[PDB]
Amino acid sequence: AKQSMKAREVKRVALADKYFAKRAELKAIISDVNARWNAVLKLQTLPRDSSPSRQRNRCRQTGRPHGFLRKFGLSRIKVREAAMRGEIPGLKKASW
Amino acid sequence: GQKVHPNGIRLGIVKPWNSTWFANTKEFADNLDSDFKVRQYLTKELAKASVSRIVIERPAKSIRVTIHTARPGIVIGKKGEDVEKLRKVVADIAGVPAQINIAEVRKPELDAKLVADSITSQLERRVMFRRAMKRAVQNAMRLGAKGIKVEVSGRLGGAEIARTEWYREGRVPLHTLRADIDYNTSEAHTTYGVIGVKVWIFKGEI
Amino acid sequence: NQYYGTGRRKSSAARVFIKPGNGKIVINQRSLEQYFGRETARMVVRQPLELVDMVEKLDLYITVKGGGISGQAGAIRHGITRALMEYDESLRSELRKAGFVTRDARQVERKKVGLRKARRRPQFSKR
Amino acid sequence: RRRVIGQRKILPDPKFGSELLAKFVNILMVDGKKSTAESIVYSALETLAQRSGKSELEAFEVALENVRPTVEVKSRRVGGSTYQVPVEVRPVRRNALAMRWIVEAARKRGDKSMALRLANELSDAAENKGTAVKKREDVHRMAEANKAFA
Amino acid sequence: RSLKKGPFIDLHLLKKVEKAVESGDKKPLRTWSRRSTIFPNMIGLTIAVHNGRQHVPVFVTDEMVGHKLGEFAPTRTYR
Amino acid sequence: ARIAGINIPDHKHAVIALTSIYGVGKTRSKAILAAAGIAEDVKISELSEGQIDTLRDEVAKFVVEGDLRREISMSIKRLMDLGCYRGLRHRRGLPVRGQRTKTNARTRKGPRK
Amino acid sequence: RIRIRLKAFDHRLIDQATAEIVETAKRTGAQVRGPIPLPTRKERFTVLISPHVNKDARDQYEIRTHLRLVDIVEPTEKTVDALMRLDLAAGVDVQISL
RNA sequence: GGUCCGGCCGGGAACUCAAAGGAGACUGCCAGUGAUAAACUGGAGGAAGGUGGGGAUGACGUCAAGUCAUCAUGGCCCUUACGACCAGGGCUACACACGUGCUACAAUGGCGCAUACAAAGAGAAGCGACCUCGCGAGAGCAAGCGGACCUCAUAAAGUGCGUCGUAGUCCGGAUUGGAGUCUGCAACUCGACUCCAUGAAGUCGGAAUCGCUAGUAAUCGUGGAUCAGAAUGCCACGGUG
RNA sequence: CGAAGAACCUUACCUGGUCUUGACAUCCACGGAAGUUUUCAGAGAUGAGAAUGUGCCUUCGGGAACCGUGAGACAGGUGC
């Protein structure tokens, strides 16, 4: 994903905290898991366009939604490249 | 790819990684990204001296700025004012404080990264090409080494078609696992493209 | 107060503690047909042990865990050969010509990249 | 290949003991299921055992050691033949061929249960009829009728 | 396919209803909202649902609110 | 009886033959048996004088036969009249499950030709 | 009743880390433990070898991360050494929890 | 030793187990052969002999082979834009063709009961026991655990019985319909899962062609990652074999 | 196969709404502590309000963050 595409998502993840902080428990719990008709709807759908569902995440370093490894902050190329120069601890060619 | 260009299995057997820190399994990611970002800003503010290689050490409550150079004559600057400032930058990206560590000497003929960025500066001033890598390998054999083998991409005279710049002298085995293969990369930023640079010194046996 | 022999077979590793005696056949406070699934293997693995003779020189008390069903019965073989060298070496030798003092020289092999099973490289037709 | 092939240990039948009978389990192994195999074996043994004399090992063993071939045909351009030349096989591979053919022969029956199928087929091995036998009678027919060295 | 038991009533129909509880038909309702499932008061109207290109009016029936109203506009055409 | 829909098959288990009762199937069978307090070890062949009642009674509680085959097929035209996706896809023969009509869908298009 | 988690990648490092602390721990209590090594909480990946095409060749990396716990079971006043004063390593979970 | 028979309790560190540190195997030794060269064939001892097994190990090179779309970048071109931001659609069309997989065509079996043993990984926008409710998926209640502890987990084929009898069926599950579940604001083209029904084609595949030399093939599950939420995919682990 | 699951967004593509030193950067100048919850209208994108918070330092201007505007050098390009 290109410089711009990353950017899009940075601002999405930023705005996530302005629809998910105090707003978070509000958006979810206090608004779901029973409570619940034409009310619940228009409340919960506050923009439609920010929620953690809508977070596409990607890397913090080079983006792209394929290849991704959320658990470790790393992605396809950003394993091989880095690891080789020894920029990720612990990694070595596999032999389990 | 020719070979798999190995040097990360060779920090997996001998000599710790160049970014040793510990984190929890999903706490990894944060600690990760912050580090590679910090390393980048670090290498730019640290191109004033010849980078042998930065490495970092983080016990997750401080980070350690552990640049090694062939120009600690610049890294000091005047007293401790120099590096002081540089630490502040660190503090921004990776949110913890930092402490400066020593830069040791061993001659820029030794350790592969010295011999990289040097020949690269030459090439970006558009001189020697064939003779560029060569002068820096007669250097490295002069004192020390048990054989150096540089490889550098083609494009002699600045020319369009590449034809590989390859000279070795001595011995560099490149599959040894009692090994002492130093390796770093540079890339030039010529007015015609990108010349990848590769330096392989077999300093010793272990 | 016991005498041991090992039991290392393909994933199932086995404690084997001999009381010298005869007249038992127990394995896990259970017995063959109570502990095994009633496989075919378990009946079979009495034969190589009767060469230098058993349940007439030793009581069988076995406490195996982990690994396979067959692996298990296997592990008996690698335990009783081992407890049938601890009294004389005459035993041992006919256990090595039996090939069941030898630890199993086969073990489950890794999948590799490009392989769909442990050594099955995808069928094609593209020529 | 360098050197020549080794041999590989196989365990005989536990209840009656015959390597050859166990090599018949191997031949009947599909799905890898040796378990579900050890059923069928005894299931066919008894059928045999009642109806036939000899041993119960020689309800299979002998009966089969006469509808096993002694010639297999391949071919090569060595001898100056383009044709299928007889090959006197090792006694062990004698077995393997017949055992195999007999087992194809009970999945060509819909005579209910791979017990009852394979059973009555092997009872007719001593009676020398059944399309299991007739494969021999096609190999050895070719070879001796169209001999082209040996 | 399913609606769970949370069908979307939608808000961009909500607005329509309030401009349709004093008026029957007066226009083909420019409604980009597809994921509706409309109240009876709005049934009997030409709800012009958006189909990714231009809207198409839909003479709703009660059996077109068993399900989304988007489904009753083709969003591709085959020939 | 043979009840609603001609034939009830026999020479086989009660549950089985009950699966052949045009809208009764695997579960729905043993569910009538459980109801009517009766076994499946016995065949239908034996047709109990108890079971004979519950035949019509429990298949009368389910939508089955003509009744079901009506309603379903009434609803294939229902949507069709309203410009539904589910609708028009039935008259091209097409699926509604998002299936592969780039490659497959040879029960919707019929077989390879 | 004390879990001090020493957790690092390669064992040629965890053992240097063990050995700088484990000395004082000798004196410490009368029911203190040696380094209990646990099984390995292991990770390992496979990521695609190239910027494009194929998927029969991926680069395989590994990364053991075995988990020693010396421990200092049965508290004394001397615990402070091997807790804080002799350990602060980068590559190892420094654990000051009792 | 206790037992409220469970490593549940203390106790014992023997044992497995983990997994750090060693021990070892080198054609070293025995016989024969050979040139009384290496080596070869057998042999012993031994867990293992003669690249031990499996990884990682991609030579110098070739294909202007792929990748300006991870990223980098020389030039060129675009600049109230092929930029930029959003809603919807299209990425999962289709009248077709081809490739790589999955599931069957059956009693070496299917379904029903009960029952036999695992290995390796995962985890605080998590996995989620328990108990309650649900035919069920699962929901409600919530313990426990950031973890050889607890939750995922009950391994499944297998086995002993019950049956069905070689029928397109008691096989097989496609299609569709209805009913429902879950993640979300919301599953319309383009979600998966369950529930019941409907019940497909198919009765082992011409011509041809490929895989696979052993813990493999075959077959049977299991776990992971990406995952809000969609694995017959990939990636890994064992079972039988 | 890239794609370690493509419902929306992803997403480059298309149709429409819409913007033009900019969605994303640095640098210079101005205003305003940053901000907070809402209203109306719009499909939303947004656009304009309505109330409320008055931070770090000051030399009292300025800055340091941060937000809009202005002006350009530039910026953007998964364009070839």
Side-chain angles (χ1 to χ4, degrees):
Chain A
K2 88 217 190 181
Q3 304 69 244
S4 310
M5 300 186 172
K6 199 174 179 186
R8 300 192 298 175
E9 197 55 65
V10 181
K11 188 190 55 167
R12 202 164 283 102
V13 150
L15 278 161
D17 304 287
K18 289 209 197 189
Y19 293 100
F20 194 91
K22 46 179 200 292
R23 319 81 175 165
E25 298 70 63
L26 289 155
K27 186 172 55 62
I29 323 176
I30 320 168
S31 302
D32 194 71
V33 208
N34 290 297
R36 217 51 162 169
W37 37 80
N38 270 76
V40 83
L41 291 176
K42 80 191 289 170
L43 294 186
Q44 279 200 270
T45 323
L46 187 58
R48 199 187 186 276
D49 292 353
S50 188
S51 158
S53 279
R54 304 268 308 216
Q55 169 188 97
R56 305 288 84 217
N57 209 3
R58 323 188 188 164
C59 201
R60 307 183 166 251
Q61 193 67 237
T62 202
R64 189 180 175 100
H66 298 333
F68 190 52
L69 288 92
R70 179 162 57 195
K71 304 176 157 58
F72 298 111
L74 298 161
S75 284
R76 185 190 59 201
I77 16 75
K78 304 299 181 190
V79 169
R80 304 185 76 264
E81 306 180 286
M84 242 287 174
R85 299 180 187 138
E87 296 188 71
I88 306 169
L91 297 194
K92 72 192 55 73
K93 306 177 176 57
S95 282
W96 48 65
Chain B
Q2 306 192 262
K3 307 181 188 293
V4 281
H5 56 285
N7 46 281
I9 185 172
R10 290 291 194 292
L11 295 170
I13 63 151
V14 275
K15 191 156 205 97
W17 312 266
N18 284 317
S19 310
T20 297
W21 46 269
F22 200 61
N24 313 120
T25 328
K26 285 207 171 186
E27 191 259 288
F28 207 98
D30 305 72
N31 199 313
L32 189 280
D33 298 279
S34 75
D35 294 324
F36 203 96
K37 297 170 174 180
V38 94
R39 285 173 63 86
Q40 305 316 301
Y41 299 112
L42 270 177
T43 59
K44 303 298 86 64
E45 61 168 5
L46 287 163
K48 58 148 162 69
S50 191
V51 177
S52 306
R53 51 187 85 175
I54 181 67
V55 293
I56 62 174
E57 260 186 17
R58 197 215 191 126
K61 62 184 177 277
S62 53
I63 196 194
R64 290 85 178 244
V65 189
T66 316
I67 184 72
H68 306 92
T69 47
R71 302 202 293 271
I74 303 292
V75 179
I76 194 191
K78 174 161 173 184
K79 302 194 175 287
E81 299 170 284
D82 187 286
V83 275
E84 183 75 69
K85 316 297 157 27
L86 274 71
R87 283 177 284 193
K88 300 299 65 181
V89 190
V90 195
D92 298 85
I93 318 309
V96 285
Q99 176 72 278
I100 180 62
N101 307 94
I102 209 148
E104 314 281 298
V105 306
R106 87 281 85 211
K107 307 193 280 70
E109 286 155 60
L110 288 164
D111 189 86
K113 212 173 185 196
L114 295 312
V115 185
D117 302 304
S118 69
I119 56 163
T120 293
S121 309
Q122 278 176 158
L123 291 157
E124 279 175 299
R125 291 168 297 192
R126 297 168 306 223
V127 296
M128 296 188 84
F129 302 107
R130 185 43 54 178
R131 281 187 177 202
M133 49 68 188
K134 204 179 185 279
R135 171 52 166 174
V137 151
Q138 290 176 263
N139 292 167
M141 298 299 280
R142 186 175 72 55
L143 317 171
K146 271 316 303 179
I148 186 174
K149 168 183 152 277
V150 303
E151 175 176 326
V152 180
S153 281
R155 304 188 70 176
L156 288 85
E160 55 185 317
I161 291 310
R163 289 184 58 165
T164 334
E165 284 172 1
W166 193 27
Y167 187 50
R168 65 261 66 124
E169 184 184 307
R171 36 202 322 274
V172 178
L174 282 108
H175 284 309
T176 39
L177 290 170
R178 179 212 169 84
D180 203 340
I181 308 180
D182 301 293
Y183 178 90
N184 295 100
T185 48
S186 298
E187 279 177 0
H189 308 286
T190 70
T191 42
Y192 49 79
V194 187
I195 296 176
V197 187
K198 297 170 194 299
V199 178
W200 314 67
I201 310 158
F202 192 51
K203 181 173 68 199
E205 329 286 298
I206 178 161
Chain C
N1 171 240
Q2 312 288 302
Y3 294 90
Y4 184 58
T6 63
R8 304 283 189 114
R9 205 263 167 144
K10 197 197 73 181
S11 314
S12 308
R15 308 174 289 285
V16 179
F17 313 104
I18 310 300
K19 296 176 149 71
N22 66 281
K24 306 184 177 73
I25 194 178
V26 294
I27 173 163
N28 293 256
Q29 311 67 70
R30 288 173 286 233
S31 296
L32 305 174
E33 54 300 283
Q34 315 178 4
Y35 174 59
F36 291 113
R38 319 196 157 131
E39 313 287 50
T40 287
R42 55 128 293 189
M43 290 93 175
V44 184
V45 299
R46 304 302 285 164
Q47 313 167 281
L49 317 170
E50 199 52 71
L51 299 173
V52 290
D53 306 298
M54 57 163 191
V55 195
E56 63 183 67
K57 284 192 182 47
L58 54 174
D59 291 305
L60 300 177
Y61 177 87
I62 309 160
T63 47
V64 59
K65 77 195 287 177
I69 307 85
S70 289
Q72 279 170 339
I76 307 195
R77 317 172 317 208
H78 191 73
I80 286 284
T81 60
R82 296 276 196 178
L84 284 175
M85 59 189 182
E86 60 183 5
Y87 306 122
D88 214 277
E89 302 295 267
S90 188
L91 300 172
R92 196 181 193 195
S93 298
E94 310 304 324
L95 285 163
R96 186 182 305 276
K97 294 155 181 80
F100 308 102
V101 68
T102 307
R103 198 294 194 168
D104 194 41
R106 300 190 302 207
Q107 160 63 26
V108 187
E109 286 183 65
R110 58 166 97 203
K111 283 188 52 177
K112 290 193 53 153
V113 297
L115 315 184
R116 166 65 173 77
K117 289 178 188 187
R119 213 215 284 231
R120 183 243 185 202
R121 188 59 190 238
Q123 304 162 185
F124 48 92
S125 180
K126 302 177 175 291
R127 293 197 67 160
Chain D
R1 292 77 60 116
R2 300 287 181 133
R3 292 190 199 205
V4 277
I5 61 170
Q7 217 290 120
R8 177 195 303 275
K9 43 190 193 185
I10 301 292
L11 280 296
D13 199 283
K15 296 194 164 63
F16 305 90
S18 274
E19 210 42 80
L20 302 161
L21 191 56
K23 187 177 160 169
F24 195 50
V25 181
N26 294 123
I27 287 282
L28 192 42
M29 215 168 280
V30 293
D31 305 311
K33 298 281 166 304
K34 190 156 180 66
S35 48
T36 62
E38 196 67 76
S39 292
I40 307 187
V41 192
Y42 302 133
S43 312
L45 196 58
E46 298 156 276
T47 298
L48 299 178
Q50 176 56 255
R51 296 180 164 178
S52 304
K54 303 151 295 301
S55 304
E56 303 184 66
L57 306 179
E58 304 167 42
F60 177 69
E61 290 174 313
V62 177
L64 194 65
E65 286 174 293
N66 290 100
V67 289
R68 71 171 197 189
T70 187
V71 297
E72 180 193 326
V73 286
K74 300 167 188 192
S75 62
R76 58 207 61 170
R77 310 289 166 265
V78 184
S81 189
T82 61
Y83 300 96
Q84 306 287 314
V85 303
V87 179
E88 191 280 338
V89 302
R90 205 167 163 166
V92 297
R93 181 43 178 292
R94 299 177 61 177
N95 300 297
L97 297 152
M99 282 173 174
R100 165 185 318 144
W101 311 342
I102 292 273
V103 156
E104 188 168 331
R107 312 193 179 195
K108 296 284 179 289
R109 288 170 172 245
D111 299 354
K112 271 63 62 174
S113 176
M114 296 294 182
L116 304 176
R117 298 174 206 199
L118 197 41
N120 305 319
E121 181 63 65
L122 272 160
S123 301
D124 304 336
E127 294 312 272
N128 308 73
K129 52 184 155 68
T131 50
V133 305
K134 74 114 90 177
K135 263 181 199 74
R136 201 155 64 84
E137 308 301 291
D138 288 350
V139 178
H140 290 36
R141 161 181 70 72
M142 177 141 74
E144 305 176 42
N146 303 127
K147 209 171 289 172
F149 316 120
Chain E
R1 313 176 301 238
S2 293
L3 274 90
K4 197 191 179 170
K5 39 173 161 186
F8 212 178
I9 313 306
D10 306 40
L11 176 53
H12 293 162
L13 276 290
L14 206 76
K15 73 196 306 178
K16 305 303 204 293
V17 70
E18 185 54 290
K19 305 163 195 166
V21 275
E22 73 309 286
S23 284
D25 201 319
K26 297 286 162 302
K27 55 174 181 302
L29 287 84
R30 285 300 297 206
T31 313
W32 272 264
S33 276
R34 291 170 58 97
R35 285 144 297 280
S36 56
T37 41
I38 63 181
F39 189 72
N41 202 97
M42 293 201 79
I43 296 189
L45 277 180
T46 38
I47 306 297
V49 279
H50 186 51
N51 56 239
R53 196 177 188 188
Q54 59 297 287
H55 296 236
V56 52
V58 180
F59 214 114
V60 300
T61 309
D62 288 298
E63 297 321 277
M64 305 198 209
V65 301
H67 303 91
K68 296 176 160 184
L69 269 74
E71 193 174 284
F72 284 86
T75 57
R76 76 168 51 92
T77 309
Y78 173 55
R79 55 180 300 252
Chain F
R2 293 173 192 143
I3 64 185
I6 47 156
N7 190 236
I8 303 182
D10 302 87
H11 183 76
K12 64 189 71 179
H13 276 193
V15 56
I16 312 304
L18 250 42
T19 80
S20 308
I21 305 293
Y22 191 67
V24 188
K26 298 297 182 61
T27 323
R28 202 76 196 104
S29 290
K30 66 169 74 217
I32 295 182
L33 312 181
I38 46 178
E40 61 81 56
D41 182 70
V42 288
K43 312 184 181 281
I44 195 75
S45 305
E46 328 284 275
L47 180 53
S48 303
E49 293 74 46
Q51 169 164 238
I52 211 192
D53 307 298
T54 52
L55 280 182
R56 75 197 166 90
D57 310 318
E58 291 285 295
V59 170
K61 292 175 170 55
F62 208 45
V63 282
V64 284
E65 314 309 301
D67 42 286
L68 184 69
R69 296 327 183 279
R70 276 178 180 272
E71 297 308 319
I72 189 167
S73 307
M74 293 173 52
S75 293
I76 303 290
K77 305 319 170 167
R78 181 182 60 99
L79 306 167
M80 169 169 301
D81 309 298
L82 297 165
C84 195
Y85 188 80
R86 307 184 173 194
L88 286 54
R89 293 286 162 271
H90 291 308
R91 39 75 52 163
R92 296 281 71 238
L94 289 169
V96 294
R97 311 303 165 64
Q99 293 165 48
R100 197 56 155 207
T101 46
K102 176 166 203 83
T103 295
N104 300 318
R106 319 310 303 201
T107 52
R108 313 305 297 147
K109 291 174 183 166
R112 290 197 298 154
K113 35 185 75 67
Chain G
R1 37 178 56 142
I2 281 161
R3 296 182 175 159
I4 49 154
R5 293 191 198 268
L6 280 77
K7 204 169 177 293
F9 305 102
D10 185 69
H11 54 288
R12 288 301 88 205
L13 185 66
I14 209 158
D15 293 317
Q16 305 178 70
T18 296
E20 57 170 322
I21 60 160
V22 61
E23 311 305 300
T24 62
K26 290 165 166 58
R27 297 80 159 181
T28 320
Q31 279 170 19
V32 286
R33 308 310 178 182
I36 308 162
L38 301 177
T40 309
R41 172 69 67 163
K42 170 60 166 298
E43 273 84 36
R44 50 171 82 167
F45 321 83
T46 351
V47 288
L48 183 57
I49 207 147
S50 62
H52 245 264
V53 320
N54 79 273
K55 199 63 170 187
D56 296 299
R58 288 194 80 181
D59 189 335
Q60 53 200 72
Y61 291 145
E62 59 174 312
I63 172 157
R64 281 168 173 268
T65 316
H66 51 262
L67 175 51
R68 261 63 163 186
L69 271 100
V70 177
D71 325 276
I72 44 178
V73 178
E74 190 174 38
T76 61
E77 49 281 303
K78 298 183 293 279
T79 46
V80 183
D81 295 357
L83 199 70
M84 290 189 79
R85 305 288 169 239
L86 298 184
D87 187 11
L88 58 166
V92 199
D93 189 72
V94 190
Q95 187 83 269
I96 56 171
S97 297
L98 300 178

